[PDB]
Symmetry: C2
Subunit: 339 residues, 2 copies
Amino acid sequence: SHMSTEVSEAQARRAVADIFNSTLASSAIGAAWELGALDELRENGKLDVSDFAVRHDLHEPAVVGMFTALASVGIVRREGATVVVGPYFDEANHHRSLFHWLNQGSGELFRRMPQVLPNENRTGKFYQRDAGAISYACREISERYFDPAFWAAVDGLGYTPTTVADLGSGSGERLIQIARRFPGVRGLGVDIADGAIAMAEKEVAAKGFGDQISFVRGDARTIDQVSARGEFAEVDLLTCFMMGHDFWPRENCVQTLRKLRAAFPNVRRFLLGDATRTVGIPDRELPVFTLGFEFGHDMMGVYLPTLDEWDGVFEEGGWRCVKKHAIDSLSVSVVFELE
Amino acid sequence: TEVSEAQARRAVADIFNSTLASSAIGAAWELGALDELRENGKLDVSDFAVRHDLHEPAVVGMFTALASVGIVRREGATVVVGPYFDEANHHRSLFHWLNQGSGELFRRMPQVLPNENRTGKFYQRDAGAISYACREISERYFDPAFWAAVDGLGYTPTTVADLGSGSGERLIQIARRFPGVRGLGVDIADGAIAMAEKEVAAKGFGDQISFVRGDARTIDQVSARGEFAEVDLLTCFMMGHDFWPRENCVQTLRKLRAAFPNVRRFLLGDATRTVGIPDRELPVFTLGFEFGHDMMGVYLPTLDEWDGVFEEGGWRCVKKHAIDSLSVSVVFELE
Ligand SMILES: O=C(O)C(=O)Cc1ccccc1
Ligand SMILES: O=C(O)C(=O)Cc1ccccc1
Ligand SMILES: O=C(O)C(=O)Cc1ccccc1
Ligand SMILES: O=C(O)[C@H](O)Cc1ccccc1
Ligand SMILES: O=C(O)[C@H](O)Cc1ccccc1
Ligand SMILES: [Ca+2]
Ligand SMILES: [Ca+2]
Ligand SMILES: [Ca+2]
Ligand SMILES: [Ca+2]
Ligand SMILES: [Fe+3]
Ligand SMILES: [Fe+3]
């Protein structure tokens, strides 16, 4: 029953108030996550705010503030010095990486909406986001949302892989997990980020797989320029998650897919997964994330293909699509099994 | 806490979209959108992006963000005011303050809460943005009570000083109302002074109104003491909370008393900390003001705390005005 055009002054006051407080609740969700509060609430159902502030060595008045902000829209409920989980807790906590993405990750971009929209201002470094924050969030996003379909696609391969290349390798947590599934397999991540390489080289070393897995600086759109080219010949599983839209526009993508094909000519399966642009979802029925993903990419000047556009580009790219998975609850997100 | 899993999905999605709405309101304001919607009730997003020279797809996003929570309604490339437009638009400066002025603060909630980090410049805000909003906040929420206090002063001022003079607009208006008056602005920010002086000069009040850098907390250090002695009306809006904690406010009030010994009336308007409002009935702003200041480590007195400090501070409160509708806000007439 949402969609009315006619409301009382009471309702309108209340609604504009909730929009205001949601703003704070929404920033608080990502913050509370990162400070270990959501976890503890998930684990114990309850928490004493004073004891929290002490244990974690936090300024207590703001801690009160963070919880009151979560309480203002029903994520938690306050009783005395106690915070309990609220009716909206599980849902919010579930999607906690998405709010973090929105606020801590991408907060600056959306804050400067009045400066980002005007054309004259659109060149060089016309926006900023917190790459450490994004990273921190995209890690849980990849796990909470993409893993099931990722693992499902891995199950239905028809072969044990021997050498896997992961594009947008990042933390290396995709490749690390591969090694753990397929004992003897070798890994190879590719990342534009200098910092992601060392974070990954460190990550790998720490988890047992030092001589199994290595990384390289490089960019899918010019993967043929990359000096490790010669070793791509032995790769028989390729993977690429949450960056496919940055291959776009279409012709870039076609080319990028063709290059990928030639550069990895013994790849049997290529697992590609990403969120896509939605179409025709009504303004007042938008689910979590959708609006921020699409809006932020518009504000960054970055094109987002629809599912159909992905469908329409693979044959041209030199790939056959043999299986597709829908992601649960992250806009219209998908995993394609290509060969 | 008994709701369906669909209830919870929808509520959580509203919080998320609300975030983007909220930021959008101040954006829309600043870019002319809200005003063009108030005047005509409609707008064409292509037309509007073109005239304003904006990247259209971001413009659409911005208007979708607003429609996602009922502020506006989209019908093609036509944007129409929605059920919550009047109210949103009314409080637009407050959303601006939260987002454009103070977004960097609340964003870094994880880095700002831990005590170890809390030294030096531990948070950042956008002084230009904040100033932009404070202008309207002053005018939409404080002015009615402000002018009512001016109307019942029982004297006609001859020299007025305004602490946190900002853009100079308070002193300007005072001059438009009392032509003979001299005006004196105290602001701690060089850039407030520069703006105000420029603004005062352009409008022709450059010979009546002038400015000095100073912190009202240390008003006794501001070496323009002779001009201060001539002042018979003192104004201070939206910063009294910054005189607290209590001991500090007592001292500041006593120094203000001394620095302006011929002030007859002293107008002090501020928002104050609320008490016992239920979490799910917090009105607009309250949570922002209070939570933001707890994050900045700045004390907020209650009303009663203010009422109980003036005598020790060297003043007698003779009149008090309630404000609509800015958390619990107030104007004291002190003497
Ligand atoms: O931040 C970005 O640029 C993204 O595109 C983030 C993203 C992509 C896919 C799923 C979730 C987030
Ligand atoms: O010095 C002057 O310019 C004035 O006459 C003062 C003034 C100018 C313009 C409007 C009101 C007062
Ligand atoms: O921004 C601050 O730190 C303020 O104190 C802002 C303010 C004070 C009183 C009313 C509205 C905003
Ligand atoms: O067009 C599609 O739907 C996807 O590109 C993948 C796919 C195609 C055919 C059968 C299954 C999956
Ligand atoms: O105590 C109060 O309510 C205010 O400090 C000011 C006031 C006092 C007495 C009569 C009127 C106003
Ligand atoms: Ca309804
Ligand atoms: Ca029109
Ligand atoms: Ca800032
Ligand atoms: Ca009282
Ligand atoms: Fe992206
Ligand atoms: Fe303040």
